[model samples]
Target chain A: AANRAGRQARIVAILSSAQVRSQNELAALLAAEGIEVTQATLSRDLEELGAVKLRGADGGTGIYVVPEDGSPVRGVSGGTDRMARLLGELLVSTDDSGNLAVLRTPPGAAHYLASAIDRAALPQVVGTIAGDDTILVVAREPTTGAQLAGMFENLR
Target chain B: AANRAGRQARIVAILSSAQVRSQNELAALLAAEGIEVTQATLSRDLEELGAVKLRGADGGTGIYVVPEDGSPVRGVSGGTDRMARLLGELLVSTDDSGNLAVLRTPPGAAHYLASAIDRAALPQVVGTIAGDDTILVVAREPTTGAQLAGMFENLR
Candidate 1:
């Protein structure tokens, strides 16, 4: 059981790292780590981990990355410290349309970062929606959206 | 899709268990499985499952148990065993927090397991949350929670 848990954690760490996309690639990586697993269990592990297979660099497929800013791990801590850290590190751009603001982070880190914005429960933010590396934050008003953009810019 | 898939598994497993109460407990169970589904999805699954309102042992309104038998024959299999074999073995238990649940199977199995749970429409569950290795069930009430505890104990 301990081995299983450890193996699971290692899998999460790899997935969260945004490396090792396909199951085959993951298996190879794990083998490098000296953990022998079949595609069956690995597939199961990926499912359980909420991992998605997406397109990778060579136009092949890779695992969908958890947005560093929206890692969902922040919920356990009751706020957005991890998210803030990631956002502080990777935020690259912000654009706005009325009450909506779009934020860009490093590839594979949008969802997690957006989740942090949600967990932060900022009053100006009506909600935050995220894709792989882009987050759309809806503010209560246009002014609030602009203010929020400023806040994110300040994170830099 | 992954969230939907995991939620389906949790709903089925909890409905079959004959006991489960509260969204938090359900979330815990699923977390153990590694499904990591969201609370909103869990709530939606409960509504879709047709979970009924019943009285708790302490006289509060709670969800009642649904019969595990009499699942509609879908031409694929006449008995529950085939479906059970696919969905049942993936079920797992959490530690004493009565808050965690885990499921282990192949990666894509989460969705299949979830679909099976949704199809089974067991009565005792309010709904489910899932990730990769887990499915969480919210009990109908405290009484249902105790019943769930007993059921999982039997599993061990």
Candidate 2:
């Protein structure tokens, strides 16, 4: 699990920094960094990462890109507006403890919701970490957690 | 106009780097840099910059944030999805010259559209700059401009 996680993180870092146009190209880049993956595993990793092939103009060669989908839901906006829309659309329940606001979303949706919240940059929110269906949002103050829980409750 | 532009850029820089919560607080930051603005002007400046006050949980104090709302179009998503959506929704026309792809959008919408394109990080694209109704996208290759113009035509 840890190695897979590290490899995925490395893939994202490489994609962000370089203009990668093919799997072979990407594989070589990874190899240079002392990682190895079979073609089957590489394909699976790309699928899990939501990577897509974007062709250039005039039938030029295509390049691989990872869109910020975070989930399967389509047509959802982003930044602050995304936060509001996703909250109203996906939020299931809210709870709090200490300086953390725990929000529940449908399975596979918490990361998407948490990303929108993080991008919204709410003042009381320090940061968020997510599982498949739960998000732990760390607030700036201890009481801020309860405050966020109540606010999220009203939004739902 | 040049000085105003510089000042606005400076404001964005300051806001990006510091946790500025109010106009007076922002003003003091500017004052330290020897830039002066009246309260009324500052208000207009914020409006022009699309800056908003985001309140914390539980009636806690708010902080100003510049949401990546490049236009008034509500319900538009962001990142690569945003690029595709905005291209289909707002692209008026496209043309090219040398290494630049010139795209037209409805007035006041180009920045938002260009921002989405920038975030998409297409390999053929170097960077983009925008005016009120037009975007000049610099391609990585000279022929990449003509290539992009044709590609954008199909998206619309």
Candidate 3:
């Protein structure tokens, strides 16, 4: 075992020293250092490190950053972009019932979508209950559940 | 490494065969088998294995379970008991603004509390945005924000 710790240390150094904009870019950097990692393993390491993607200052592609204070992922301002990205990944379909918006995703994906929605802090949304493949979203009354449902439906 | 994976397999076996009600109890069981583990390591393993705390079927103390279908945590009934337990541990104070219920917790505790609340699937809760020490919960109208705040306030 060469040491996951050693590899993670190099990951930190590479992330800090270079503008790693994507997973493949990070993987290339690691390869340059003779550290090979699978995409899945790389993803897990980034999450363990609490690295997040923030929009580049010049309003271009995003870059990953590791928070110095060690906190949970911070989405881009107001979490708009992250929300869209997560929805793109997890949202399968949507429906409405009175003041509730129902979202469907692949099995085991509801929590990720619900967590993203919660972080988005959309004023129309109240909270969410996520099961294996379903999410029950309570929309603020007068906001119309249809409106909330439409948000996800149109995301397709 | 025989450390993480072999330990996780034992964890799975122990959870599958017996009623594990707490981390301490599980640790004791593992110790009996000559496997010692730190609480932090155990917690991370449980999370990695998607183990969840669920109320016992007979309405006694809760038990930890590893879902066979590999789904996220499922709370009892409407998740009332889990919400109460999480609030007891994490909630420091509560406030309200219009239809929003504001909850305060120790830093790094908001996500846990908010996820519990979301799983609780409370009727009045719209959703939650959890920061390091704060959670913003939207309450449905007809359920006053003050009413929502009072629920946590009275938990004391």
Residue pairs clashing, model 3: A126-B126, A126-B127, A127-B126, A127-B127
Residue A47 accuracy (lDDT) in model 1: 75
Q: Interface root-mean-square deviation for each candidate?
A: 17.5, 15.8, 24.9
- TM-score order of candidates, top first: 2, 3, 1
Give Cα distance to truth, residue B92, candidate 3, Å: 0.2
lDDT of 3 by residue, B1-156 (tens): 238898787777666324466786666555433356878889899999988775432334655756544223442123343455456556778999899889887665576677767776666778889997789998877777787787766442
Model number with the top lDDT: 3
If ranked by DockQ, best first, what sequence of candidates would result?
Answer: 2, 1, 3
Model 3 alpha-carbon drift over 4 Å, by segment: A1-156, B1-3, B9-26, B29-71
For A9-113, candidate 3 gives per-residue lDDT tens digits of: 667655532345678766655543335687788888888987766543234555565653422433212333345545655677889989989988766557656
* Model 2 C-alpha lDDT per residue in residues A1-156, reported as the tens digit of each score: 238778876676555323456686666555434466766777888889987664432235544556564432322222433355456556788999878889987666676668767776665678899997899998775446887776666555
lDDT score, candidate 1: 0.50
Estimate the lDDT of model 3.
Answer: 0.64
The CA lDDT of each predicted structure is: 0.50, 0.62, 0.64
Error of 1 at B5 (Å): 46
Using all chains and alpha carbons, the TM-scores for the candidates as numbered come to 0.32, 0.41, 0.35
